[PDB]
Design a binder for this molecule. Structure first.
Ligand SMILES: Nc1ncccc1OCc1ccccc1
Ligand SMILES: [Yb+3]
Ligand SMILES: [Zn+2]
Length: 606
């Protein structure tokens, strides 16, 4: 049972196809049109069904060319309102019908952000983008909003003619809108069955540049050239992903670089990955996020978690493939360096939540929990830790990558549970069952806190980061003079970040140490968002008032939750910046992404 969905379950009826016909109304901040759902009964004598909705206005529901009865139920908080439809004729098992729903979205849709022209790069045109994961699709259109159901889709989207529409689908042409010559209709086809959380839309002043045989980069013109360079490894990473995972089935692999308020590093929308502009470091150093999004083309998009309780299946396998792609590109010592970094990130997560907290379990129970509230590094890093440990238990990366390919193959176009994964693991490694039987499954899958066993990690690239961090932590005032710009001489940007992550784990440091770091290392000058993020965190946590405006600026000039949430949190916890932090949030709140606005609000207890 999917405890995040109010719709009829897959055992009752299945959506097979969505045809979406809509217009994007920027003056009203609404999407208006029709969702025609092709629905297959899984039951005998089916007379009604329920769909998820959230903040939708339903005009009418039509089956066989006649309006039918429906009802919207009481709102259930973040789940929205169940929509029961009365079918005009009882269906037998496997019978399919088309249900056409006339709807309009609300300006407050939790799936959508609408930006004024001034919130964009060009300053001339407004911009819309969606983000449906986990359960925000109901906020765009009525649907069985559960990843246990996979469907194909087609769409025609009417937009102001000077603007461009894109979706998580193959572009299927454009014409002027016969009903309004100030408009264009963009058309789309997604013929690979997908969970509805993968439905995506952007409308804006978009341009494109080709960067590979099957990849265009899209953004506002101001960002095109930089994006093309930053993401040029994309094809090389695809070929590696295909070798590890099997054929890329989705046709194109385009990238869209969003405006700065996009809430995540990336979103694996099929045919069109969405990424944050915080990746634009200028040197391709944040490309693991591309490797990650590519990897989802197999783990997540082909093999899908059945409910959000098993999100780790999506994230853990993706991070595992991610790290392999980067290891292939940059060497096994680097994969290990990043693997160990992730364990670091997990200690952070477990420390923040508390070692007994329910969100630190690998498999969570989302009954009455908002997924956006439960969301964290845990499913990513505890999932990865599990796989890396199993990798080391069963004979190394070559062997376990055999399993990953078999696993993807076995479960393509399907939605699965942790038990499905574990069943197949045991079947695949039948001759290694005794060894599999040594794993403390109950602790790994169901217990809170750090895993019962830490994997083995090569230390090569990590040592210098630990060594420098230890020098700073153990230093007294008369040692500060010994620190010097040349300390960083042989460290890559990755290592600079790990050094800062190491140090941040022991924060606060004395204020004088942190001032000295700025003096000798000039971290204030680094634009790499991962580094700047951790450095500003260390500064605020060490009570440096100078850093207050820098932290406020980064928190608000971009909206990647990864960065924005802990920066506001740090600023709220520093007494000198507490008032300004609350004030700043309150001022930006209306113009933020709705999910980000919601979470920063809870975070700040405002
Ligand atoms: N939030 C979650 N926490 C633990 C397991 C699964 C989860 O899924 C919810 C989710 C996924 C993606 C985006 C937002 C929320
Ligand atoms: Yb001393
Ligand atoms: Zn992911």
């Amino acid at each position: 049972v999917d405890t995040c969905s109010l719709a009829s379950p897959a055992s009752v009826c299945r959506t097979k196809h969505l045809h979406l016909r809509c217009s994007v109304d920027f003056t009203r901040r609404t999407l208006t049109g029709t969702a025609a759902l092709t629905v297959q009964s899984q039951e005998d004598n089916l007379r009604s069904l329920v769909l998820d909705t959230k903040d939708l206005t339903i005009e009418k529901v039509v089956i066989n060319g006649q309006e039918v009865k429906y009802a919207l139920g009481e709102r259930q908080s973040y789940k929205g309102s169940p929509m029961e439809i009365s079918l005009p004729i009882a269906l037998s098992k496997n019978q399919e019908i088309v249900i056409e729903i006339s709807f309009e979205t609300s300006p407050k849709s939790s799936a959508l952000q609408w930006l004024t022209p001034e919130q964009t790069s060009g300053k001339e045109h407004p911009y819309l983008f969606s983000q449906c994961q986990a359960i925000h699709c109901r906020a765009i259109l009525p649907c069985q909003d559960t990843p246990s159901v996979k469907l194909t889709y087609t769409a025609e989207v009417s937009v102001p003619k000077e603007l461009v529409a894109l979706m998580s689908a193959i572009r299927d042409g454009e014409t002027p809108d016969p009903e309004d010559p100030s408009r264009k209709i963009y058309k789309f086809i997604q013929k690979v069955p997908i969970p509805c959380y993968l439905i995506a839309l952007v409308v804006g002043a978009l341009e494109s540049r080709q960067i590979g045989p099957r990849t265009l980069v899209w953004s506002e013109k101001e960002q095109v050239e930089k994006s093309a360079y930053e993401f040029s490894e994309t094809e090389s990473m695809l070929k590696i992903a295909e070798d590890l995972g099997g054929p890329y089935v989705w046709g194109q692999y385009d990238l869209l670089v969003l405006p700065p308020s996009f809430p995540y590093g990336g979103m694996e929308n099929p045919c069109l990955t969405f990424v944050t502009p915080t990746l634009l470091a200028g040197d391709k150093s944040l490309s693991n996020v591309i490797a990650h999004e590519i990897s989802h083309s197999w783990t997540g998009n082909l093999v899908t978690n059945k409910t959000w309780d098993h999100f780790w299946l999506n994230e853990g396998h993706t991070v595992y493939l991610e790290r392999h792609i980067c290891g292939r590109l940059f060497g096994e010592k680097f994969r290990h360096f990043n693997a160990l970094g992730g364990w670091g990130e997990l200690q952070n997560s477990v420390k923040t939540f508390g070692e007994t907290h329910p969100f630190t379990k690998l498999v969570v129970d989302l009954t009455d929990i908002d997924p956006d509230v439960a969301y964290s590094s845990v499913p990513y890093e505890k999932g990865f830790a599990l796989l890396f440990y199993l990798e080391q238990l069963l004979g190394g990366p070559e062997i376990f990558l055999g399993f990953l390919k078999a696993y993807v193959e076995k479960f393509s176009y399907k939605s699965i549970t942790t038990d499905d994964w574990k069943d197949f693991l045991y079947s695949y490694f039948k001759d290694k069952v005794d060894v599999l039987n040594q794993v403390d499954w109950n602790a790994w899958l169901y217990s809170p806190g750090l895993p019962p066993i830490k994997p083995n990690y090569d230390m090569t690239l990590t040592n210098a980061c630990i060594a420098l961090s230890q020098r700073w932590i153990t230093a007294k005032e008369d040692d500060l003079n010994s620190f010097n710009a040349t300390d960083l001489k042989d460290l890559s940007s990755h290592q600079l970040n790990e050094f800062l992550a190491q140090t941040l784990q022991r924060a606060p440091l004395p204020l004088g140490h942190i001032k000295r770091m700025q003096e000798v290392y000039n971290f204030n000058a680094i634009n790499n968002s991962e580094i700047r993020f951790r450095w500003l965190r260390l500064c605020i946590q060490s009570k440096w008032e100078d850093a207050i405006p820098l932290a406020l600026k980064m928190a608000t000039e971009q909206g990647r939750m990864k960065f924005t949430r802990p920066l506001f949190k740090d600023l709220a916890a520093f007494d000198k910046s507490h008032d300004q932090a609350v004030r700043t949030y309150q001022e930006h709140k209306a113009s933020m992404h709705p999910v980000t606005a919601m979470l920063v609000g809870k975070d700040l207890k405002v």
